[PDB]
Amino acid sequence: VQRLTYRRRLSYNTASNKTRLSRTPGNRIVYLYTKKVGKAPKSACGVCPGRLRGVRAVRPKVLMRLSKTKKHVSRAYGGSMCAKCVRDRIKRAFLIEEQKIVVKVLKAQAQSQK
Amino acid sequence: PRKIEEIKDFLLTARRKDAKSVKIKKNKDNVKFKVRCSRYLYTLVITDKEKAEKLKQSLPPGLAVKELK
Amino acid sequence: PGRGAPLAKVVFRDPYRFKKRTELFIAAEGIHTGQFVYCGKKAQLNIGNVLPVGTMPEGTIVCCLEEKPGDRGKLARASGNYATVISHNPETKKTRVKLPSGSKKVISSANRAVVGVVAGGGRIDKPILKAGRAYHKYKAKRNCWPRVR
Amino acid sequence: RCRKNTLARRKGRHMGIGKRKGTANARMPEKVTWMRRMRILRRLLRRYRESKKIDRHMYHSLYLKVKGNVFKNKRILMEHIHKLKADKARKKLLADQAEARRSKTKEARKRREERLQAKK
Amino acid sequence: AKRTKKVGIVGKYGTRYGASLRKMVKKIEISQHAKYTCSFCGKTKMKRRAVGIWHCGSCMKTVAGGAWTYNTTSAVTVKSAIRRLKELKDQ
RNA sequence: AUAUUCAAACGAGAACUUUGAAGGCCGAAGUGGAGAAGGGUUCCAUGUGAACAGCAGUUGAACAUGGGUCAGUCGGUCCUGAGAGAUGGGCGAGCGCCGUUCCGAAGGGACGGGCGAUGGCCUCCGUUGCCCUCAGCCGAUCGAAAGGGAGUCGGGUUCAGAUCCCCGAAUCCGGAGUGGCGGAGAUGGGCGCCGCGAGGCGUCCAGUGCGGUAACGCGACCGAUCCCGGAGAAGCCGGCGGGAGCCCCGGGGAGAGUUCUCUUUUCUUUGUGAAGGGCAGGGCGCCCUGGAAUGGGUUCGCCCCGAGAGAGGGGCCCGUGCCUUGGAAAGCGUCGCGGUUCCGGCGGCGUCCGGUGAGCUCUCGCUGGCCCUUGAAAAUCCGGGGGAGAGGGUGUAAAUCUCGCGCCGGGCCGUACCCAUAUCCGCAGCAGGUCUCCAAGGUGAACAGCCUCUGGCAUGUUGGAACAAUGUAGGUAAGGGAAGUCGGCAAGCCGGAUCCGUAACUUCGGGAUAAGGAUUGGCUCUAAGGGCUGGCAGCCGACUUAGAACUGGUGCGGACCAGGGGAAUC
Numbered sequence A: 001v002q003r004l005t006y007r008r009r010l011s012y013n014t015a016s017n018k019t020r021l022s023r024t025p026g027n028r029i030v031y032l033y034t035k036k037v038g039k040a041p042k043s044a045c046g047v048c049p050g051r052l053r054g055v056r057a058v059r060p061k062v063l064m065r066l067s068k069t070k071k072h073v074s075r076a077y078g079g080s081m082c083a084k085c086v087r088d089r090i091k092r093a094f095l096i097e098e099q100k101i102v103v104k105v106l107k108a109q110a111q112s113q114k
Numbered sequence B: 001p002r003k004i005e006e007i008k009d010f011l012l013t014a015r016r017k018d019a020k021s022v023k024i025k026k027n028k029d030n031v032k033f034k035v036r037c038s039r040y041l042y043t044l045v046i047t048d049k050e051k052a053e054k055l056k057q058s059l060p061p062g063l064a065v066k067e068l069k
Numbered sequence C: 001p002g003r004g005a006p007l008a009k010v011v012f013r014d015p016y017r018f019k020k021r022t023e024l025f026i027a028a029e030g031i032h033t034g035q036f037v038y039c040g041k042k043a044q045l046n047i048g049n050v051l052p053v054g055t056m057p058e059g060t061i062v063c064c065l066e067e068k069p070g071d072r073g074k075l076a077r078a079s080g081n082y083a084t085v086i087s088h089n090p091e092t093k094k095t096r097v098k099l100p101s102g103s104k105k106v107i108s109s110a111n112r113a114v115v116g117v118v119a120g121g122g123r124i125d126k127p128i129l130k131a132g133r134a135y136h137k138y139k140a141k142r143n144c145w146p147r148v149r
Numbered sequence D: 001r002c003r004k005n006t007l008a009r010r011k012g013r014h015m016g017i018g019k020r021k022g023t024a025n026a027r028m029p030e031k032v033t034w035m036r037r038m039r040i041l042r043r044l045l046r047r048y049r050e051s052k053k054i055d056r057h058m059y060h061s062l063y064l065k066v067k068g069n070v071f072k073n074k075r076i077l078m079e080h081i082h083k084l085k086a087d088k089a090r091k092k093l094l095a096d097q098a099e100a101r102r103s104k105t106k107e108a109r110k111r112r113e114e115r116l117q118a119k120k
Numbered sequence E: 001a002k003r004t005k006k007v008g009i010v011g012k013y014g015t016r017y018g019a020s021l022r023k024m025v026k027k028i029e030i031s032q033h034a035k036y037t038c039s040f041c042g043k044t045k046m047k048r049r050a051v052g053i054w055h056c057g058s059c060m061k062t063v064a065g066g067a068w069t070y071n072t073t074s075a076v077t078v079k080s081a082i083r084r085l086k087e088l089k090d091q
Numbered sequence F: 001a002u003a004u005u006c007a008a009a010c011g012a013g014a015a016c017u018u019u020g021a022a023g024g025c026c027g028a029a030g031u032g033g034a035g036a037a038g039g040g041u042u043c044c045a046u047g048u049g050a051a052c053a054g055c056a057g058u059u060g061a062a063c064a065u066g067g068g069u070c071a072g073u074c075g076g077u078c079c080u081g082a083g084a085g086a087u088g089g090g091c092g093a094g095c096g097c098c099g100u101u102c103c104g105a106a107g108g109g110a111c112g113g114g115c116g117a118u119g120g121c122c123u124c125c126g127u128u129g130c131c132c133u134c135a136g137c138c139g140a141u142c143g144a145a146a147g148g149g150a151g152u153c154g155g156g157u158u159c160a161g162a163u164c165c166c167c168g169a170a171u172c173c174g175g176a177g178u179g180g181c182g183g184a185g186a187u188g189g190g191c192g193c194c195g196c197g198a199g200g201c202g203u204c205c206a207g208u209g210c211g212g213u214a215a216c217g218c219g220a221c222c223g224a225u226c227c228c229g230g231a232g233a234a235g236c237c238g239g240c241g242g243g244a245g246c247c248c249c250g251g252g253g254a255g256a257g258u259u260c261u262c263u264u265u266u267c268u269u270u271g272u273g274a275a276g277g278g279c280a281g282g283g284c285g286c287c288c289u290g291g292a293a294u295g296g297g298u299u300c301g302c303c304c305c306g307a308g309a310g311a312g313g314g315g316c317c318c319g320u321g322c323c324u325u326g327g328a329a330a331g332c333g334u335c336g337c338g339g340u341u342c343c344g345g346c347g348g349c350g351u352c353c354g355g356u357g358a359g360c361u362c363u364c365g366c367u368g369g370c371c372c373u374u375g376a377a378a379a380u381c382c383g384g385g386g387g388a389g390a391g392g393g394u395g396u397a398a399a400u401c402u403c404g405c406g407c408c409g410g411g412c413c414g415u416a417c418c419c420a421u422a423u424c425c426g427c428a429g430c431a432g433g434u435c436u437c438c439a440a441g442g443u444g445a446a447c448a449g450c451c452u453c454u455g456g457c458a459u460g461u462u463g464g465a466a467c468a469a470u471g472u473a474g475g476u477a478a479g480g481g482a483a484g485u486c487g488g489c490a491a492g493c494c495g496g497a498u499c500c501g502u503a504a505c506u507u508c509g510g511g512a513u514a515a516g517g518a519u520u521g522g523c524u525c526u527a528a529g530g531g532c533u534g535g536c537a538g539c540c541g542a543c544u545u546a547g548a549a550c551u552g553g554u555g556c557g558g559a560c561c562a563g564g565g566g567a568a569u570c
């Protein structure tokens, strides 16, 4: 078989020295240096273990080239927090405000009674 | 490179100022018109020699055309 | 690494500017993520909260005690340890506490202290069975393990 | 030479007790054997379940039995399924005729009662 | 089939470290590798992450407990004492 | 550390140079192909044969002449790590030392407004000095050619250089008064009229984008100080699954080898890059309907479910696989012409169809286990919350745009070769030492040993003739079997796999391959173990196990690989 060599001055199997075999039009098997696999962003809620959806999974400096539409999703906190925690946050805010109103009115009624 | 699937848009690209040349590769079942622009190479592929010849006469006059084989 | 007791990452908001201040505490038993902890002079006495020893009733179990006011916690901060408030002296502003070694010490009542017992108790119960486990234990602390007589 | 010897080996020669150096598990692992058997049997069970030969309750029961290693082969499992279906069909037929008799006599007694009430 | 008579989880330790030591570590091993019930969701998915750190797989809620158990008798008696002292102070 | 032989050529001179033929070795954990540290011209051609290469040399890593290392996209350059180190400060007779945020007035920046000067058709903007206003750094600086770190691939080319030269396809970052152009913003509605109508005329009003219940999608789709978050950013081991490279199987071509006999035979070969577009194929702890015990689903194992399972219908991520632009023009294999030449010359023809596997290597993914072990930081980039502000009054639209195409630029240093039984260190061409990458066929459990293909070499600083003693390294010995010796030292016995069988003692885990037995070759069969298509029929298969007959001078783990055992004491 045709066993082959590196094409750079780095000879150690480190994280950056990662390759894959490819067949050229000249009918030869060479290495081709792959790029590191990217990761999708984590949700800012801090509880969900899954990665966000609708956002490309690329390396951090690749995101300069991409466009905002491919980088985020059309929603509040879009591309930064999962929809589950978004709706939970909305409901929490509304209910806390409602109970604050209830507490204020009950406190004022007690003060008026006393 | 890019693939152009229509005729009039390819013609507009041919009239583009940056178009440096066009090449016609006459292989079997296809005729490929390759327009060399500043950044991309645009190829329009058709499967009819009579479309090929009518397009060859309808090509821009000032464009440098060369047949290759 | 190197410390038996776990640590808690608690987020407060600055009362003087728009920010959020993150602090690292000694975790007391029973504290869970998402819990609310209250720090101050008039915070109610329940597990997790920190308040000065001069306000808690005697017999209270206390962890991460502060040896001098402002020191930000020095005493009873190893895994499973705690301290106990013994008696108060309303004049001279001093209180008596019992340290985990059994010594009784007098401190100023104006110093804060976490309520509860440090998490990770009974760590010494399990016997290290092998020099490998001992080696891994002291590798995360310092070069002192293979003691030669 | 290699191809001819391989053809002879495929026919079965040269593969006796004498020409063995590794253990039986080293030659053909038991984990792979069990894996293959479980895949085959579970596939058969799914095909029967979606072909509606067997119901989901019996499917779950004999799925747990397959995992518990009571069916050695596809054929053995298939004959067990046939015997179970036969016994179930007989019990179902007996139950149907019994309940038909019960319903018939119940409605006949109800008819007697209602015609008595109409007579009075 | 019952694979071993006396040794259980510490069967992995072979004929080493002494019978008394293996017996003593057996209970701690069982307690620290057992799965507990999440007092927040009720699912039995409370696992140990490190020493003194307990995590639930479904809630994603982490609780600071004991080294080899989810909770310690010292912790529970301190919690009871603290509750009673709070009730005494507020009368 | 197994090994040479025949003939020819040059040459004054050949055991050693070269060419051809033969016989061999390394045997893919190499005597192969490439790098790191280190060497520094040893690399390439010609010439010589004074000296050196422990014989010789027509040879050389020798000597003398001349040549050779080409980058925006390989790396340094940048960041910080363990750590080193100034200023302030302290100490010190003193050269100086401690110290790295500690006893410092440690910011020379800016959204924006005003003031005063200037150039450009002083329009509006830019360069500006001052005032008003806003503003934290963990401490200057150094620290990795294996860590972090956007961006180049295919073919050709020399004597010696190629991701560097040539040809062709790309790509990242930075710049832009008049924004170079297009597109987006964004061009609608109401009312009153003329006009058969279409449409047009004239007033008022809106216009910082749309679709999907939803996950989310569409080519953009304003916005500062400030705040939140993400990526960078991570352990080890086990199991399983997908995808590539290689190996294997059945054919079809082209060219070779054998053809005393046979072989539709044996061997070689049978391409498509990066970058875009679409689609298979994987994964989802994503969404909707709906509501489940006679519990169900499901993995090799697990595991999951009224905090919503099964059943349907959807969305997202990867996509290194296929097709397509690149692309057949090029590359390769064959047959044949031209240049006698000096040729990226010319020509035909082909570069095809399928199947498989607990196969080996790489990579992606799911999932588990172990820790009193929890398995980097920073530069850099990005999204979100907010609404300080800006833009036009209906038009020739404006502010603005992370959309498409276009224009310009990428400076400095390294780049040859060796990499090791001859370019490195050990005084040397020294059996020593020195960090890695790729890895074919058979046998076999196997990266074991043994033989072979691709590639490489000439037996390790000499040749010839004999075959004495004594040596060094191997063997074999009748009968006895440790009688030798301080002592079974040395050598020898056993050895793999399958089927039986297995004690004392014990911390119940072991002991244990205890000990002790039988079998194993070749050939011809039998049975069992599955997928696809429409309890049955057809079609595809791939390796194992068990049994039986026959047969050889009882021979069969036939080479290689390959446990002597037991009873006791310290």
Ligand SMILES: [Mg+2]
Pocket (backbone or CB within 6 Å): A023
């Ligand atoms: Mg390819």
Ligand SMILES: [Mg+2]
Pocket (backbone or CB within 6 Å): A054, A055, A069, A070, A071, A072, A073, A074
């Ligand atoms: Mg999106």
Ligand SMILES: [Mg+2]
Pocket (backbone or CB within 6 Å): C143, C144, C145, C146
């Ligand atoms: Mg030490």
Ligand SMILES: [Mg+2]
Pocket (backbone or CB within 6 Å): none
């Ligand atoms: Mg050998």
Ligand SMILES: [Mg+2]
Pocket (backbone or CB within 6 Å): F033, F034
């Ligand atoms: Mg080499």
Ligand SMILES: [Mg+2]
Pocket (backbone or CB within 6 Å): none
């Ligand atoms: Mg080499």
Ligand SMILES: [Mg+2]
Pocket (backbone or CB within 6 Å): none
């Ligand atoms: Mg040379």
Ligand SMILES: [Mg+2]
Pocket (backbone or CB within 6 Å): none
């Ligand atoms: Mg000499």
Ligand SMILES: [Mg+2]
Pocket (backbone or CB within 6 Å): none
């Ligand atoms: Mg270039």
Ligand SMILES: [Mg+2]
Pocket (backbone or CB within 6 Å): none
């Ligand atoms: Mg630096």
Ligand SMILES: [Mg+2]
Pocket (backbone or CB within 6 Å): none
């Ligand atoms: Mg110093």
Ligand SMILES: [Mg+2]
Pocket (backbone or CB within 6 Å): F144
């Ligand atoms: Mg570096």
Ligand SMILES: [Mg+2]
Pocket (backbone or CB within 6 Å): A016
């Ligand atoms: Mg690096």
Ligand SMILES: [Mg+2]
Pocket (backbone or CB within 6 Å): none
């Ligand atoms: Mg479901």
Ligand SMILES: [Mg+2]
Pocket (backbone or CB within 6 Å): F328
């Ligand atoms: Mg061609």
Ligand SMILES: [Mg+2]
Pocket (backbone or CB within 6 Å): none
């Ligand atoms: Mg915004």
